[PDB]
Design an enzyme around this catalytic site. Structure first.
Site, short mmCIF file in Angstrom:
data_model
loop_
_atom_site.label_atom_id
_atom_site.label_comp_id
_atom_site.label_asym_id
_atom_site.label_seq_id
_atom_site.Cartn_x
_atom_site.Cartn_y
_atom_site.Cartn_z
N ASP B 13 41.37 45.14 61.22
CA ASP B 13 42.23 45.78 60.31
C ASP B 13 43.62 45.54 61.50
O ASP B 13 44.40 46.95 61.18
CB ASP B 13 41.65 46.71 60.13
CG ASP B 13 40.48 46.74 59.48
OD1 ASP B 13 40.75 45.80 57.85
OD2 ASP B 13 39.66 47.06 59.02
N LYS B 16 46.15 41.23 61.74
CA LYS B 16 46.85 39.88 61.99
C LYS B 16 47.17 38.83 60.99
O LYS B 16 48.25 38.10 60.91
CB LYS B 16 46.05 39.64 62.74
CG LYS B 16 44.65 38.75 61.88
CD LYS B 16 43.48 37.98 62.30
CE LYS B 16 42.62 37.27 62.02
NZ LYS B 16 41.76 38.83 60.93
N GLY B 40 39.84 36.85 55.30
CA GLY B 40 40.79 36.80 54.01
C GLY B 40 42.15 38.28 54.17
O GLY B 40 40.73 39.43 53.52
N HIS B 41 42.86 38.04 54.10
CA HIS B 41 43.34 38.62 54.08
C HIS B 41 44.93 38.78 52.29
O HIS B 41 45.33 37.31 52.56
CB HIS B 41 45.07 39.35 55.08
CG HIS B 41 45.83 38.09 55.63
ND1 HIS B 41 44.84 37.64 56.22
CD2 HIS B 41 47.17 37.68 55.06
CE1 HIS B 41 45.92 36.62 56.51
NE2 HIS B 41 47.29 36.61 55.98
N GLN B 211 37.94 37.25 62.94
CA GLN B 211 37.05 38.73 63.31
C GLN B 211 38.07 38.74 64.30
O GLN B 211 38.48 37.84 65.00
CB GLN B 211 35.37 38.62 63.61
CG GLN B 211 35.12 37.95 62.17
CD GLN B 211 34.78 36.47 61.52
OE1 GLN B 211 34.77 35.84 62.95
NE2 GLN B 211 34.42 36.50 60.60
#
Ligand SMILES: [Cl-]
Lengths: 421, 416
Positions: B13, B16, B40-41, B211
């Site tokens: 969070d 990135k 995933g974003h 991560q």
């Protein structure tokens, strides 16, 4: 002005990393292991080391067991006792507080898993398996009475089910392991610390740092002939993850390579020699397991394999050994490509069934007759021996930095200093 | 050479996503190097899991390296997802050495957790045990069948005897998953050759960690970590490239810390300042809905991240969230049982005893969301940004004052 060197075998082991490692060790200020467990280097400063890096014999050299290893604390103490009994000081040792711990249940698990198969002694594999599964006990945990007992209780709950129900065998009580192993950890505590800080400090301050790979590139769990590989990453990349240093701080990688190929295992081997030439190479090269006595498989230099090693391990410098062994062979061959299913390829197949269908495409070079065992510079090699050595460099794309013409120390010839930039 | 790694320096969070989206526009190759289908974003909204960010650009090669674990069924779902929305995927390359996630990994994952879930952990365990099935095996009818037979002979004992539950017949998996392999075959190749080729010819290559650094299996808060190495070193092992070919590493940090888990959190704020940061920063799980724990910037953690991940460049994000807080703190050391230390303890019982030692800096009051340059920041905000860089040892290369792309301010070009 970063000055780090990684030394690794480029093949399946037995490349002669030992001699080169001994040499680079002399000039190192810090020497570090970064993967593997109590796997053996054979030195006479007659000593055999398993976990402890090779710089230990020099009082002033810092020796680091990085976070990437798995450590049997009992075996580690045996190795320390062995050195102490021989008058060797170990105050220079540093053990990662993040290294994983091999416990007795790992050895039993190792035995049980091996006997269930039809296609592995020291609990190294199972320790790495616990690491991936996130139940592993680390050196920092071993040093904490309450945390060690708690993780021991949690893991034995699961391990004992596995032993009792899947393998119909006795497990371990917490008390068979706890006090015994906590005490081992107490004896190791003086060495335990943040080894990433230790290494980064040495690196940042321009100290000469040597990283020693424990197995060859083709035994790499990712890039080797999987599954006949070790359970970790001896490639130079393994240093970054295995000690906690950035890739920008690993300056030179020495690939130790023999002038011909050798294998211990039974897997595919494109350039294998079954004839009188392989017999001669084996006899002259003394290619027999030093502990097992079993003959090794031999074959021509394979540059497809070595270029593969160059890519995955970022080889920058080549140390070419056992060149003398090729004397008196009128036609020398080097594999430059593979013929596979009717196509010419320049990669090591990931699929061993495909690797087994690969026929070598070879260059032929004329051999030499002179005894080159006394040679101490490139200019002293007979024409055909020098051209052979130069061709290996050319084919692999790796600059020559050392060559060896015999087993002795003085028979290692330095072409280039790998500590200087 | 011109390669960049982008990684979160904390526990996720960090933001990135913005940074990755920006760097992937200028990249010619984009690669994943570890993890599974568990990321995933949002990027018309897209969420990618296994497939690297460059896939939306037809001419960018996207690589899934050898370091991943790949659920072939899940990968085909992702591919279909993209195709249904008009997105071509001819540019994708899948490592022939990537490990494969099978149905027994999913059941094992569930069974293991119930004893103490996409089968990523169990697939890494099988890798470590050297019984894993790889992408090259999956494409080989005989090899796949044989390895499946061998593994199920062991997995079925585990299931039936230890977990008193049903296992899998060979036929339950074989035809279904071999079929999946045939649909992925066109993308499968030696990704080490692909990447080393791109690197040697001076192409801009971007590697993206899945991560944060503090979730790294070696260097994070073990055991509350992911099952692989998102640190920049992971790129070397996970894609088969030399350390010398990884040129820049961008650490993405948030201007304050957040955590999802319930483990040690030295700078955690429990007061009205925590509340303000959480609300202004929207610090809630996007899927779980659950509030994240927040706290002051922790430079002990980020210095640790700099060492272990070789961070060369700093992307500092969500700076605007700290607006209107008169006294801002940065933790620079821990007091731990009366000792003052500046390392992250490897033992979580010890980390749980760490009390922060903090620097204090004066805040600002002005809205900074329209700022597009260090020189346009109010004095105390520029000072705060500068101090973060001074304390962590990482030069500033980007900073962000809002969620939009145009609020990502570039200080240096990391591809140069
Ligand atoms: Cl977290």
């Amino acid at each position: 002005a970063m000055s780090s060197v990684v030394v690794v075998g480029t093949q399946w082991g037995d490349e002669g990393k030992g001699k080169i490692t001994d040499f680079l060790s002399e000039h190192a200020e810090v020497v570090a292991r970064y993967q593997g467990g109590n796997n053996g280097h054979t030195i006479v400063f007659k000593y055999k080391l398993h976990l402890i890096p090779s710089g230990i014999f020099y009082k002033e050299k810092i020796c680091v067991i990085g976070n990437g290893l798995v450590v049997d604390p009992k075996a580690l103490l045996e190795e320390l006792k062995y050195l102490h009994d021989r008058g060797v000081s170990t105050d220079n040792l540093r053990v990662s507080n993040r290294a994983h711990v091999i416990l007795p249940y790992h050895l039993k698990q190792d035995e049980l898993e091996e006997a269930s198969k039809g296609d592995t002694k020291k609990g190294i594999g199972p320790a790495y398996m616990d690491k991936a599964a996130r139940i592993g006990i680390r050196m920092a945990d071993l040093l904490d009475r309450e945390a060690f007992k708690e993780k021991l209780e949690q893991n034995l709950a699961q391990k004992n089910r596995l032993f009792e129900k899947m393998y119909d065998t006795e497990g371990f009580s917490v008390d068979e392991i706890f006090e015994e192993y906590f005490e081992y950890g107490q004896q190791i505590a003086q060495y335990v610390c943040d080894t990433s800080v230790v290494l980064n400090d040495a690196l940042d301050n321009n100290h000469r740092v040597l990283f020693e790979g424990a197995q060859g590139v083709m035994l790499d769990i990712d890039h080797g002939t999987y599954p006949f590989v070790t359970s970790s990453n001896p490639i130079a990349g393994g240093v970054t993850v295995g000690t906690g240093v950035g890739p920008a701080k690993v300056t030179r990688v020495v690939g130790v390579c023999k002038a011909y190929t050798s294998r211990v295992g039974d897997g595919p081997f494109p350039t294998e020699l079954h004839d009188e030439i392989g017999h001669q190479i084996r006899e002259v090269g003394r290619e027999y397991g030093t502990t097992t006595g079993r003959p090794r498989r031999v074959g021509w230099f394979d540059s497809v394999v070595v270029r593969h090693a160059r890519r995955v391990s970022g080889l920058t410098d080549l140390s070419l050994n056992s060149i003398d062994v090729l004397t008196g062979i009128p036609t020398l061959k080097i594999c430059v490509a593979y013929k596979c299913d009717g196509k010419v390829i320049d990669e090591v197949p990931a699929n061993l069934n495909i690797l087994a269908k690969c026929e070598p495409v070879c260059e032929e070079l004329p051999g030499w007759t002179e005894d080159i065992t006394g040679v101490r510079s490139l200019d002293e090699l007979p024409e055909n021996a020098r051209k052979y050595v130069e061709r290996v460099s050319e084919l692999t794309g790796i600059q020559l930095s050392m060559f060896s013409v015999g087993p002795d120390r003085n028979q290692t010839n330095i072409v280039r200093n790998v500590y200087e930039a």
